[PDB]
């Protein structure tokens, strides 16, 4: 991050939502169609999924926005299947609604007017009516036409009731506690939904199906007890196309009660809710930058779905060409309907279908994605050493190396108070302590100084302060990527890190000769930090926000008393303690010159550590034969 | 054809600019907005009148000299809304153009408008009757219906309009 | 058990308003609490 | 410290296809830099001081005419102790491509050595 | 150039265009001419005095 | 600073009508022109739209269409773009509106 | 996401709400050690009094207002708690749910309100018993807990990070259940 | 022109109702640990890209020293906008808040 590009946008909000078919071809680069990816002389085949239109690859500029690999944000593709195919996602739902509908009115089996109440239950709690929804179960083939009037109106009223006064946007209000109600009442929905008999519109039964886990789907033989009502009216691998056929008519007949099932907030966009949105006719090919050798595993994954995409495209060829032959090629395409399934859930979900990891497998656990490269991160400007212990050291301090002040580094932008000690940085260089190691110029430019001379580099220290060649950079300066100095600030930090007090801001005393880092020991009553080989993370902040924290807010003088119990945690250890006990002693005597010595040798005027500019003493304890301090009284005047 | 268009613009605002924040935004967005084409504004910016910064909290007066701009969390740039009176000079078409003669050449007419933009009239925008005079010494001129040089104005009619390059270009056809 | 989650929130077509702290780490927010629990404001003197 | 890393120019080949990769340097423009560390056998010196981005192997390779080398992949600076020929049993006797290099670091006792 | 630095973030139109006559912009073009004169727009000022002079007089 | 600024910061191009991370590109320019960034998922092909010169921009393909022009530069971890990538592969839209329309 | 709003209500980063006062009184377990040492304080008065300077603090906050609601609870409770706790109408709010701590002066919790006057009650000793207990009560006020604090992490690395140190089930898992 | 006339005044209009005046605000006046460190980093960073400086430099070079130093005598140009979990917020000025 630069602190001189700014950004104007920022996120508010996002919400999840699913690809129709229709954006995913809008949106688009170039459709892919066979399963090769990358053909002899080292170019990729264009029509795979090594493309030049999906983004650069290898020393290739792309086909769609002509940028090189540096530049190239890359490009996702789709492919076409030829049969709408289950999203393993969602068929944990999709059979809960392709089950719990009869197939000859196309409504639920549930009765309309209950379902009914569903869909004015969960349109109060879209808002934030937790209350008039239980109030709802109060209003209780004519009569139902005004019962649920009586319901809708009685929604319709406390909706504008509510959002007069003063309560509920029509955003909706949704907080945890209408979270709950929703949850229990849409799992008060489906359980009920499941269990039916007969549709209690037109009373008759419908052949229940069967889950076979993933991949296939079944329906049951419609028994001969139960058949009658089905005449007085007036098992099978069934397709992905049938289950689509039923599910559309399904979807139109209750708009109504989905509107408000699949809706958390009130549904503003008016956008229908569809049982397309649970199939996936179209796959998604993420970018080639995401999909670079290691080949690699999502290539694999789509190259047998496009391996399969072609057999089922020819084996469709015979279907235009026709009887012995239209019953074998018709029981061996239906063979590629469940392969072809079988992919695109092994392409999400390797559980679902030793195996390839899935994309699902790129997510879910620890050394995944969310965890091990969201909420924790590998970081630049930070370091890593052995500790070892250390006196005279003002205790907020840390010692650090001439090993780690010549790599780590600091953007400092020139100023009028800068250019005395920031041009003298710049001509010590990047071998050199306190030195420089760049410099940013103004139009975001970077002139490393590792592969120059003394006189081009105190060149560079008078180019360093110019006014502006640009109107377009007229108000920005250069940054002098400084050496780290002993006035900037450290985070050092030792695993496990339990508890707070455990990553601490210290500020920085560089030491001229020995590489390791080292740490008073006040500090190591917090980091539960013995010095047998242990080594702790140091992190160097970038800005000034997180300058004026690590030495504001997260001080290591700041955490003097932890939270825990509000008892101290920082303080002296083995050999003070000891000291401390013979010092205080009674038998402690100490001559003018002796008393002296030990006061300046631990106070050191010139460190800015008394408050007198002189340092004043006592008069000694016993003034003759000779005089003497004793040792209560070193420190008294300490 | 000056039009006055009321604009709202979310702009950005350094700090050298923090005791004199109308300057800052003359500075930065407004001065290097003058003489150019803008796509939100319709045609070429001439230029602006009555800057006026919204203040952050609104329980201020429009009397009130201090105002507060919303810094950044990251990087120390506030941003804020503005409002000014753009004036725009915009070509649109079937509209008709007073110009000024620059090129006389076989291929186009290549003549300033108002002094400063261009304006081209192809070849097959001309038609039959107006056929050309070569010039061996220097550049000739377009014989017109009625035997006569061309000099001063030309009233055309807008064909199309080109901004796509650095500077605006107006298509013309020489027809009623 | 982050699909779980994910169709729990994409059937329910779930917008979240970026209050947690771990979802301003997802897409990169200020953290609301203690330091980003306000906002800072520049007085300038011109109008 | 004796450590030893095995240079071998057969790890990439079977089934009697010929040595495309020989020890020592060929004939074209190869920069003579490094003739500090190797000897005219391709092979380095006994005894000499190697850091980081050394060369310890200089091979010719035959589909590219080019003398490739192997540098020193370690930030410990080394002095290189003894230089083997493993030689490969077989009637049709083979020219080496097996060279096993021994080196030595000086573990002068530093501050954060454990006693 | 095109950074937020040059550029406004989102520009916008608060209200309808109506077309003025040569009075406004004259009056205009002696106001905004006016107070700038009394930098890359120095060479904008001259682009502006070539519409100025074409509204009051001739070249 | 730790888990944005220094690891993997990038001012990636986001779309204002889609909200989508992972569209938006920078379009091929004629001669003398410009590279504007722009939008793939709410344009419209120009044999589609049966404008106005600058709405009009074409890929390097060879293919020119006019649509969304509405777009903008927004700081996020470069993670978020590869979990959009993850999920648009699953059907998942991830609809990212920024503040200032 | 809990944290210490601006109400001194802590609650969740969501906007709901977990305690209307963090404990009960809002004050910092890192800047109380020394409230309830009555006897230290009253020996370093002057030294005290010049870290808070309580006359450069007089012109902001409203010094009289809680203290009249201080007596009018605290001569209640004595002349009640003769009944337990499911008699009592209590009549009034404690102090410190109904003015703000942090900008009225007085406004404290009960326990130091009673150990503040039991402790001035026992013994009696240039500073009188009237200007002792005017520096308690803004000892206490800066012992507040600062608006913005992230609580549910201090409170839930201060129950994680003692478990480092471990006829009925006992220790980590009893915390596991 | 008619749309965003009706966007921009809605958002004038919820920014006033989140709009806590000055003489009905109720919330502490001191300046939090949170509030000062931020007001140090914020003007440390406007120092460092040459915002005008209000006090006698002292041979400072640091610019969180500088701004440091401009807390002392009350000069930093900034105000607090402390957020309610409403979404309401109060605007307390640096010159209005004590310290410690
Ligand atoms: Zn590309
Ligand atoms: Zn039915
Ligand atoms: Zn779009």
């Given at each position: 991050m630069d602190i001189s590009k700014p950004v104007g946008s920022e996120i508010t909000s996002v919400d999840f939502g699913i690809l129709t078919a229709k954006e995913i071809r809008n949106l688009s680069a170039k459709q892919i169609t066979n399963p090769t990816v990358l053909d002899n002389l080292g170019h990729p085949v264009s029509g795979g999924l090594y493309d030049l239109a999906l983004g650069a690859f290898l020393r290739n500029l792309c086909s769609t926005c002509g940028l090189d690999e540096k530049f190239c944000?890359?490009?996702?593709?789709?492919?076409?299947?030829?049969?709408?195919?289950?999203?393993?996602?969602?068929?944990?739902?999709?059979?809960?609604?392709?089950?719990?509908?009869?197939?000859?009115?196309?409504?639920?089996?549930?009765?309309?007017?209950?379902?009914?109440?569903?869909?004015?239950?969960?349109?109060?709690?879209?808002?934030?009516?937790?209350?008039?929804?239980?109030?709802?179960?109060?209003?209780?083939?004519?009569?139902?036409?005004?019962?649920?009037?009586?319901?809708?109106?009685?929604?319709?009223?406390?909706?504008?009731?509510?959002?007069?006064?003063?309560?509920?946007?029509?955003?909706?209000?949704?907080?945890?506690?209408?979270?709950?109600?929703?949850?229990?009442?849409?799992?008060?929905?489906?359980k009920k939904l499941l269990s039916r008999g007969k549709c209690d519109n037109c009373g008759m039964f419908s052949p229940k199906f069967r889950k076979d886990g993933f991949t296939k789907i079944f329906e049951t033989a419609l028994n001969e007890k139960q058949i009658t009502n089905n005449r007085v009216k007036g098992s099978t691998y069934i397709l992905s196309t049938e289950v689509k056929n039923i599910l559309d008519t399904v979807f139109r007949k209750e708009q109504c009660v989905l509107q408000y099932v699949f809706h958390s907030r009130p549904n503003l966009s008016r956008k229908l809710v569809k049982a397309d949105s649970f199939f996936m006719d179209v796959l998604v090919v993420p970018p080639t930058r995401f999909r670079l050798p290691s080949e690699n595993s999502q290539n694999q994954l789509l190259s047998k779905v496009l391996t399969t995409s072609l057999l089922i495209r020819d084996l469709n060829d015979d279907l235009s060409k026709l009887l012995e032959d239209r019953r074998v090629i018709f029981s061996r395409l239906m063979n590629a309907f469940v392969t072809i399934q079988?992919?695109?859930?092994?392409?999400?979900?390797?559980?679902?279908?030793?195996?390839?990891p899935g994309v699902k497998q790129a997510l879910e656990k620890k050394e995944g994605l969310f965890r091990k490269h969201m909420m924790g991160k590998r970081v630049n400007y930070a370091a890593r050493?052995?500790?070892?212990?250390?006196?005279?050291?003002?205790?907020?301090?840390?010692?650090?190396?001439?090993?780690?002040?010549?790599?780590?580094?600091?953007?400092?932008?020139?100023?009028?108070?800068?250019?005395?000690?920031?041009?003298?940085?710049?001509?010590?260089?990047?071998?050199?302590?306190?030195?420089?190691?760049?410099?940013?110029?103004?139009?975001?430019?970077?002139?490393?100084?590792?592969?120059?001379?003394?006189?081009?580099?105190?060149?560079?220290?008078?180019?360093?302060?110019?006014?502006?060649?640009?109107?377009?950079?007229?108000?920005?300066?250069?940054?002098?990527?400084?050496?780290?100095?002993?006035?900037?600030?450290?985070?050092?930090?030792?695993?496990?890190?339990?508890?707070?007090?455990?990553?601490?801001?210290?500020?920085?005393?560089?030491?001229?000769?020995?590489?390791?880092?080292?740490?008073?020991?006040?500090?190591?009553?917090?980091?539960?930090?013995?010095?047998?080989?242990?080594?702790?993370?140091?992190?160097?902040?970038?800005?000034?926000?997180?300058?004026?924290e690590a030495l504001n807010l997260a001080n290591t003088d700041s955490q003097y008393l932890t939270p825990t119990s509000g008892s101290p945690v920082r303080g002296l250890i083995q050999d003070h303690i000891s000291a401390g006990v013979w010092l205080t002693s009674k038998d402690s005597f100490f001559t003018r010159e002796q008393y002296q010595q030990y006061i300046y040798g631990c106070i050191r005027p010139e460190d800015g550590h008394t408050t007198r500019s002189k340092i004043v003493t006592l008069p000694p304890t016993i003034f003759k034969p000779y005089p003497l301090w004793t040792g209560k009284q070193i420190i008294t005047t300490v | 054809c000056i039009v006055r268009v009321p604009i709202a613009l979310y702009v950005s605002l350094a700090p050298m600019y923090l005791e004199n924040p109308l300057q800052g935004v003359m500075k930065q967005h407004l001065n290097p907005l003058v003489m150019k084409y803008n796509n939100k504004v319709g045609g070429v910016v001439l230029g602006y009148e009555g800057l006026k910064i919204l203040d952050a909290d609104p329980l201020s007066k429009e009397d009130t000299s201090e105002k507060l701009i919303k810094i950044t969390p990251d990087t120390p740039f506030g941003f804020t809304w503005c409002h000014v009176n753009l004036y725009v000079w915009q070509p649109q078409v079937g509209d008709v153009l007073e110009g000024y003669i620059f090129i006389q050449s076989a291929s186009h007419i290549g003549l300033l408008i108002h002094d400063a933009f261009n304006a081209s009239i192809k070849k097959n925008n001309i038609p039959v009757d107006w056929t050309f005079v070569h010039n061996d010494v220097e550049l000739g001129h377009w014989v017109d219906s009625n035997g006569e040089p061309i000099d001063g104005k030309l009233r055309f009619t807008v064909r199309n309009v080109h901004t796509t390059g650095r500077v605006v270009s107006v298509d013309g056809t020489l027809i009623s | 058990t982050t699909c779980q989650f994910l169709t729990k929130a994409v059937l329910d077509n779930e917008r979240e308003q970026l209050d947690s702290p771990s979802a301003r780490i997802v897409v990169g927010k200020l953290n609301n609490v203690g330091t980003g629990s306000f906002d800072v404001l520049a007085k300038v003197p011109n109008a | 410290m004796y450590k030893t890393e095995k240079v071998?120019?057969?790890?990439?080949?079977?089934?009697?296809?010929?040595?495309?990769?020989?020890?020592?340097?060929?004939?074209?423009?190869?920069?003579?830099?490094?003739?500090?560390?190797?000897?005219?056998?391709?092979?380095?010196?006994?005894?000499?001081?190697?850091?980081?981005?050394?060369?310890?192997?200089?091979?010719?390779?035959?589909?590219?005419?080019?003398?490739?080398?192997?540098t020193y992949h370690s930030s410990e600076p080394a002095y290189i102790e003894e230089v083997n020929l493993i030689g490969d049993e077989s009637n049709k006797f083979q020219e080496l491509q097996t060279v096993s290099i021994k080196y030595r670091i000086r573990r002068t006792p530093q501050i954060g050595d454990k006693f | 150039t095109a950074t937020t630095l040059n550029t406004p973030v989102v520009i916008h139109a608060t209200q309808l265009p109506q077309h003025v006559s040569t009075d406004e912009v004259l009056q205009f073009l002696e106001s905004f001419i006016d107070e700038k004169e009394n930098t890359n727009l120095s060479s904008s000022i001259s682009q502006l005095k070539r519409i100025q002079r074409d509204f009051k007089g001739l070249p | 600073?730790?888990?944005?600024?220094?690891?993997?910061?990038?001012?990636?191009?986001?779309?204002?009508?889609?909200?989508?991370?992972?569209?938006?590109?920078?379009?091929?320019?004629?001669?003398?022109?410009?590279?504007?960034?722009?939008?793939?998922?709410?344009?419209?092909?120009?044999?589609?739209?049966?404008?106005?010169?600058?709405?009009?921009?074409?890929?390097?393909?060879?293919?020119?269409?006019?649509?969304?022009?509405?777009?903008?530069?927004?700081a996020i971890p470069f993670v978020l773009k590869y979990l959009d990538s993850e999920l648009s592969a699953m059907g998942i839209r991830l609809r990212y509106n920024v503040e200032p329309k | 996401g809990v944290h210490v709003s601006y109400d001194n209500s802590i609650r969740d980063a969501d906007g709901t709400l977990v305690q209307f006062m963090y404990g009960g009184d809002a004050i910092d377990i890192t800047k109380e050690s020394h409230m309830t040492q009555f006897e230290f304080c009253l020996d370093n008065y002057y030294a005290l009094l010049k870290?808070?300077?309580?006359?450069?603090?007089?012109?902001?906050?409203?010094?009289?207002?809680?203290?009249?609601?201080?007596?009018?609870?605290?001569?209640?409770?004595?002349?009640?708690?003769?009944?337990?706790?499911?008699?009592?109408?209590?009549?009034?709010?404690?102090?410190?749910?109904?003015?703000?701590?942090?900008?009225?002066?007085?406004?404290?919790?009960?326990?130091?309100?009673?150990?503040?006057?039991?402790?001035?009650?026992?013994?009696?000793?240039?500073?009188?018993?009237?200007?002792?207990?005017?520096?308690?009560?803004?000892?206490?006020?800066?012992?507040?807990?600062?608006?913005?604090?992230?609580?549910?992490?201090?409170?839930?690395?201060?129950?994680?990070?003692?478990?480092?140190?471990?006829?009925?089930?006992?220790?980590?898992?009893?915390?596991?259940? | 022109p008619e749309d965003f006339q009706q966007h921009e005044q809605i958002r004038r209009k919820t920014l006033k109702e989140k709009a806590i005046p000055k003489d009905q605000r109720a919330t502490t006046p001191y300046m939090t640990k949170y509030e000062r460190a931020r007001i140090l980093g914020?003007?440390?960073?406007?120092?460092?890209?040459?915002?005008?400086?209000?006090?006698?430099?002292?041979?400072?070079?640091?610019?969180?020293?500088?701004?440091?130093?401009?807390?002392?005598?009350?000069?930093?140009?900034?105000?607090?906008?402390?957020?309610?979990?409403?979404g309401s917020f109060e605007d307390w000025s640096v010159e209005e808040l004590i310290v410690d």
């Open positions: 944000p890359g490009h996702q593709g789709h492919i076409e299947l030829p049969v709408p195919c289950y999203n393993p996602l969602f068929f944990n739902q999709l059979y809960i609604y392709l089950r719990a509908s009869c197939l000859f009115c196309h409504h639920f089996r549930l009765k309309s007017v209950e379902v009914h109440r569903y869909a004015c239950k969960l349109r109060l709690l879209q808002y934030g009516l937790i209350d008039e929804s239980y109030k709802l179960d109060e209003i209780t083939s004519t009569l139902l036409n005004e019962l649920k009037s009586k319901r809708s109106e009685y929604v319709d009223m406390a909706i504008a009731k509510a959002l007069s006064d003063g309560r509920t946007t029509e955003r909706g209000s949704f907080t945890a506690t209408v979270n709950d109600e929703r949850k229990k009442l849409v799992h008060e929905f489906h079988n992919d695109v859930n092994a392409f999400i979900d390797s559980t679902k279908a030793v195996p390839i050493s052995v500790i070892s212990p250390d006196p005279n050291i003002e205790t907020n301090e840390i010692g650090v190396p001439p090993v780690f002040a010549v790599k780590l580094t600091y953007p400092e932008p020139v100023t009028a108070y800068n250019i005395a000690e920031l041009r003298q940085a710049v001509i010590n260089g990047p071998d050199k302590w306190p030195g420089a190691t760049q410099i940013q110029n103004e139009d975001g430019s970077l002139v490393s100084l590792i592969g120059m001379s003394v006189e081009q580099r105190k060149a560079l220290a008078n180019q360093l302060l110019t006014p502006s060649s640009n109107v377009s950079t007229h108000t920005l300066n250069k940054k002098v990527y400084r050496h780290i100095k002993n006035r900037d600030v450290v985070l050092m930090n030792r695993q496990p890190t339990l508890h707070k007090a455990s990553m601490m801001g210290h500020k920085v005393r560089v030491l001229p000769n020995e590489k390791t880092l080292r740490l008073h020991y006040a500090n190591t009553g917090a980091y539960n930090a013995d010095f047998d080989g242990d080594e702790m993370n140091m992190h160097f902040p970038q800005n000034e926000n997180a300058r004026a | - | - | 071998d120019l057969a790890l990439n080949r079977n089934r009697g296809d010929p040595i495309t990769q020989h020890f020592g340097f060929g004939n074209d423009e190869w920069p003579k830099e490094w003739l500090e560390k190797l000897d005219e056998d391709g092979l380095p010196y006994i005894g000499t001081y190697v850091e980081e981005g050394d060369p310890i192997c200089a091979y010719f390779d035959d589909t590219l005419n080019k003398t490739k080398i192997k | - | 600073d730790r888990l944005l600024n220094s690891s993997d910061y990038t001012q990636a191009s986001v779309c204002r009508e889609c909200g989508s991370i992972l569209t938006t590109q920078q379009s091929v320019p004629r001669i003398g022109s410009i590279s504007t960034v722009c939008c793939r998922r709410c344009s419209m092909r120009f044999e589609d739209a049966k404008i106005d010169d600058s709405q009009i921009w074409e890929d390097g393909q060879g293919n020119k269409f006019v649509g969304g022009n509405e777009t903008t530069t927004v | 870290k808070y300077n309580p006359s450069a603090l007089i012109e902001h906050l409203d010094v009289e207002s809680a203290l009249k609601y201080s007596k009018k609870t605290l001569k209640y409770r004595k002349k009640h708690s003769k009944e337990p706790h499911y008699k009592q109408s209590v009549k009034y709010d404690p102090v410190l749910a109904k003015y703000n701590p942090a900008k009225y002066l007085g406004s404290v919790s009960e326990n130091f309100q009673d150990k503040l006057e039991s402790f001035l009650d026992k013994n009696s000793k240039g500073v009188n018993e009237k200007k002792f207990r005017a520096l308690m009560q803004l000892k206490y006020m800066r012992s507040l807990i600062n608006p913005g604090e992230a609580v549910g992490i201090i409170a839930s690395q201060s129950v994680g990070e003692p478990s480092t140190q471990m006829n009925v089930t006992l220790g980590i898992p009893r915390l596991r259940e | 914020t003007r440390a960073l406007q120092i460092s890209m040459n915002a005008p400086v209000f006090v006698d430099l002292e041979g400072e070079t640091d610019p969180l020293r500088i701004a440091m130093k401009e807390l002392a005598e009350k000069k930093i140009p900034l105000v607090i906008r402390r957020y309610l979990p409403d």
